[PDB]
Amino acid sequence: MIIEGDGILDKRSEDAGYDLLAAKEIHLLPGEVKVIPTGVKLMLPKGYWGLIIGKSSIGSKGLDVLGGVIDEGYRGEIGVIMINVSRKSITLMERQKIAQLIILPCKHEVLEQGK
Amino acid sequence: MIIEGDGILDKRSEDAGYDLLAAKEIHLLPGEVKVIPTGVKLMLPKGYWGLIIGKSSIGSKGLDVLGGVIDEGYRGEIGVIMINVSRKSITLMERQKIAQLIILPCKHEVLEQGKV
Amino acid sequence: MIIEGDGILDKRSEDAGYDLLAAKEIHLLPGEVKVIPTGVKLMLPKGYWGLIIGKSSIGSKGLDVLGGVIDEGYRGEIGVIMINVSRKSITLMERQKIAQLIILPCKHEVLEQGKV
Ligand SMILES: O=c1ccn([C@H]2CC(O)[C@@H](COP(=O)(O)OP(=O)(O)OP(=O)(O)O)O2)c(=O)[nH]1
Numbered sequence A: 001m002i003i004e005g006d007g008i009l010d011k012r013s014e015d016a017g018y019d020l021l022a023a024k025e026i027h028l029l030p031g032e033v034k035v036i037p038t039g040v041k042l043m044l045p046k047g048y049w050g051l052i053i054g055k056s057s058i059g060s061k062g063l064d065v066l067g068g069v070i071d072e073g074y075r076g077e078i079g080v081i082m083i084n085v086s087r088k089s090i091t092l093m094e095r096q097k098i099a100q101l102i103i104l105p106c107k108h109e110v111l112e113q114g115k
Numbered sequence B, C: 001m002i003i004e005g006d007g008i009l010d011k012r013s014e015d016a017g018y019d020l021l022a023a024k025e026i027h028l029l030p031g032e033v034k035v036i037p038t039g040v041k042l043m044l045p046k047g048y049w050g051l052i053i054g055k056s057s058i059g060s061k062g063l064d065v066l067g068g069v070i071d072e073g074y075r076g077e078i079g080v081i082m083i084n085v086s087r088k089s090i091t092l093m094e095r096q097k098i099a100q101l102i103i104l105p106c107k108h109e110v111l112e113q114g115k116v
């Protein structure tokens, strides 16, 4: 798969997703929502989409990653929407692992107004 | 796919899911959970289920979608289980986009007890 | 597929996923995140992975069910991670339905630096 940036890591065959990395250091206040930049651009194979889903490691810190859909056509850089549901401030360091990207098949069917 | 209603917009070949519009106005308080009607019913093809995932514009506001699994065997009105995990109350408007539905493939297996 | 435990129930061919039950009774103090044990091990068919999607009703009950990805190679016990987002202690009881597990396809490729 074609990519652009160093904010994503290869994965073993047994692994379902690629690790996404924070492009820069981030500080999330309590309850704050932030779109964290990864510095990566993707060229997803034709017929697939990328699912952004959290990693148990940062989830265990009171950080909820809000499910992200990466479209096949999307050509900008990937961003991870994250919320600090905890009651204190949290810091994500540069290049720290923050989420995963999973490539799933996509089915395109036109819509019909039947019954 | 056969659909009924107008709370779901068609999509492009480069798109992953079909947007889902709020059938009515919704006001969620901080930490409140409400199911949001879409007024859309549909027939999922054979061998596929429908996954409801939020759109980045609502996600970026602290709204998250809970249990968005639409079963192959389900013909009722689709409803979006939205929770406001932000620190303040937000209002979603009528016909405002609220989530996406991505048709994914079903994988049926029989569960067999055994050593793993 | 091969399972080892009691925390999982078979499904209808029209059902997208298998229900997960709470292994033991769990106390979640306010603002506490806890890996809810299920007591089941899996042997996911080759090429697939397991998607854990929280059960709507327990997200209303003041709990948030985090990142649920079971890798093809994972041979341990399945746990469901959750955070207590309310002002009171919430006790999850044994054999309580806490989530769903859906087997989905997985694409594997080498990452190549190019231009998009
Ligand atoms: O977690 C996410 C979600 C989205 N994106 C990007 C990539 C992608 O496919 C594109 C479009 O997201 P989308 O169209 O859902 O969100 P929107 O802001 O609600 O869009 P609009 O009304 O134009 O559909 O946004 C991310 O990087 N991360």
Ligand SMILES: O=c1ccn([C@H]2CC(O)[C@@H](COP(=O)(O)OP(=O)(O)OP(=O)(O)O)O2)c(=O)[nH]1
Residues within 6 Å of the ligand: A054, A055, A056, A057, A058, A097, C052, C066, C067, C068, C069, C070, C071, C072, C074, C077, C078, C079, C080, C081
């Ligand atoms: O809801 C979940 C999420 C993960 N797991 C397990 C099973 C599985 O495939 C393995 C790995 O989780 P993961 O690798 O995401 O978390 P991490 O702690 O951040 O790991 P690392 O960077 O080493 O991968 O963790 C569960 O049982 N339930």
